[PDB]
Amino acid sequence: SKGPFEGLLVIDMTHVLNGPFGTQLLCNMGARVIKVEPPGHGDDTRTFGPYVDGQSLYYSFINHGKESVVLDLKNDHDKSIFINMLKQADVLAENFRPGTMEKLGFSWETLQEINPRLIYASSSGFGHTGPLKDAPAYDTIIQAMSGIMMETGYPDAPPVRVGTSLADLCGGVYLFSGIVSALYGREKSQRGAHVDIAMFDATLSFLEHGLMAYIATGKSPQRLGNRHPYMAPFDVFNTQDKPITICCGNDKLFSALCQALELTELVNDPRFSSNILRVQNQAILKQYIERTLKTQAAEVWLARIHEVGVPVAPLLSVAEAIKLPQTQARNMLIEAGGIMMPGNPIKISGCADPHVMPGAATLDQHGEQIRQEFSS
Amino acid sequence: KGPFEGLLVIDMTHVLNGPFGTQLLCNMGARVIKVEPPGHGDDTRTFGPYVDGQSLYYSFINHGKESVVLDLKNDHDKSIFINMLKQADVLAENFRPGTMEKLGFSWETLQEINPRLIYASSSGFGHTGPLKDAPAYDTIIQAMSGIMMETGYPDAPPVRVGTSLADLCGGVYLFSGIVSALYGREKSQRGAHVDIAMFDATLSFLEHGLMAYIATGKSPQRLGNRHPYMAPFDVFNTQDKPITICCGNDKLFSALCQALELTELVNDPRFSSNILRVQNQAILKQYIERTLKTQAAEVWLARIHEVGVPVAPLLSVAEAIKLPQTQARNMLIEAGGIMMPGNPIKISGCADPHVMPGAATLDQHGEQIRQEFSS
């Protein structure tokens, strides 16, 4: 089977990262996705680095399998075509600044009149409501205002961005989530709804410990770096060559670790005998640990620590991560349009998950046939 | 009150990854019955910090879920648990792979207990692959996925992202996977097995990190706060606290130079284009901060917004949740007296109240539920 959304029509006006990441998932799991791109260069990601064979890897990664037609909604003929699309469509998705779609003549209220069964999915930095709805909201801006920058990095170091476009991506997955939720709900109600996702809201929901601690203690930010707030030794540690993470969450495990490091004297040491004590005295404990670790390469410790049954792992680069046998076992690296790119992490039995997939479309590639299809 | 009204979720998930997914279902109308081990309950009940008796960690991600204790090794309970499954729409668990099977509940067995049942599992590496039975806390996943290596200032050691990203990713993927299967079932009239890996989930969030590698063979990238293709597009210090300036074209750069009284930079051959500003970003940043350090951040936010250049303060979590925008989006709700994050999925026509039912004490619904499902 080609997925649970096979037979759905998505009219996709999304661009950049936040919107298209969400719609890619719908396409991954069966839905027909027609990318409506504006005149000019089209979707902004066609002009994004990096490039392979003159073609943006950025566009390809998050638009593979999506058809492409250039439409100009300022033109009445094109507008007529777009409306015919909407009448056949289940989902209209866009991540323009709030108000953009309304000014082209497509408020949520007008959309309902066009198609009562149409799901309207919106994604933006702050959502379509609130005092900050019209404010600029790049991923970096959202990361800054959400608190995640100040929660991130070594405690004495300056605040730093998460190593990826977290706000955009959170918005994307919640966009996809909201859409499917609406599709399920529509099934009984027989009416569409407006899914309105904010990148800012999305990022707030990923704060976890940063917010919990504040609500209870009044301290903010936390800034814990690599170490766990409530367990120790549970942190990133250096070795002779390269760092590893040791996650030692209880007394039984601490004893095992000490055995493997030949630090058995620390097990009943009054500084380290219980977990709460090890958390309290984590710094001095780490000094003991890294002094022993520095005498052997990481690969030696991975063997010795794992042997005694303590959770441990190397710090890998993206390159190393995608080359792991596990990645290939999970089909998380696919080939689409002859390009290697990340796969679909949502695995559902009875749904095909091909390693080879249809590639991304060139600009207005399907424009001729699509214009014919929806002209009337 | 939401699209999932009328659904029954049997929830055996614990810690963060699994419950984050089911909390979303509960938020949007599903009846979620949390099945906890007798005595200890969900591990998060004994996670700090504590407020008025309850664990904040538990309450944040389990508010509105009913609580029953059951021992699936005990026959009387296993029988009640089975009656639950025959009426359930979804069974969710985030144990280690094989655990649910060893208790007598393979996907195969589950299928013939209730052919319509959606079985959903979240784990460190999924239920398939050579690393399926490997230890996989959030920190281990971040380390092995490449995200730690991508995170932090360029010449600084690798660092975890400031949250449990792997668990949360798997969480939302678990939720979205469940609801996808539910839509599918509405035509197929049959259940399916949703199988999410925190590792797969995290890899899908690598973005520019993985693209750049595929393109150039270099890895990691480590760019810190700086955009790879636009300048000045970075975090900058002021007299008191940092801000971010996100200036992506020449028109904006001219406007920004006006606000900072650095008009001489506009036609400077080092900064005349975006490509040149990226090449010479370091020295450009030095010029910018020398000016910025003369005024407090509030002053600069005003001056730079005035000329239409995207700018923002770096805020603590404390300041973020107090913004009027947060209140406008109902992202800080109260459940059982405790302030906590709201639901980012806003759907028109679906209720989104500020006051929600609080977390359940252990076995709180146990007597009434065990009656309800004894047969």
Residue numbers in the entry:
A (entry chain B): 6 to 381
B (entry chain A): 7 to 381
Publication excerpt:
Insight into molecular basis for the ATR might be gained by establishing functions for YfdX, a putative membrane protein, YfdV, an unassigned membrane transport protein, and YfdE, a class III CoA-transferase that resembles YfdW. The yfdXWUVE operon is regulated by EvgA and required for the oxalate-induced ATR. This study shows that YfdE is acetyl-CoA:oxalate CoA-transferase. We suggest that ACOCT is an accessory enzyme that serves to “prime” oxalate catabolism, forming oxalyl-CoA when formyl-CoA is not available.
The structure of H6YfdE was solved by molecular replacement using a biochemically uncharacterized protein from Brucella suis. Six subunits, forming three dimers, were placed in the asymmetric unit. In all subunits, the N-terminal appendage and the first five to six residues were disordered. The monomer topology of H6YfdE closely resembles that of other class III CoA-transferase superfamily members. The large domain is formed by residues in both N-terminal and C-terminal regions of the polypeptide chain, creating a central hole through which the other subunit is threaded. (His233 from a partner subunit) is located in a GNxH motif that forms part of a loop opposite the covalent attachment point Asp173.
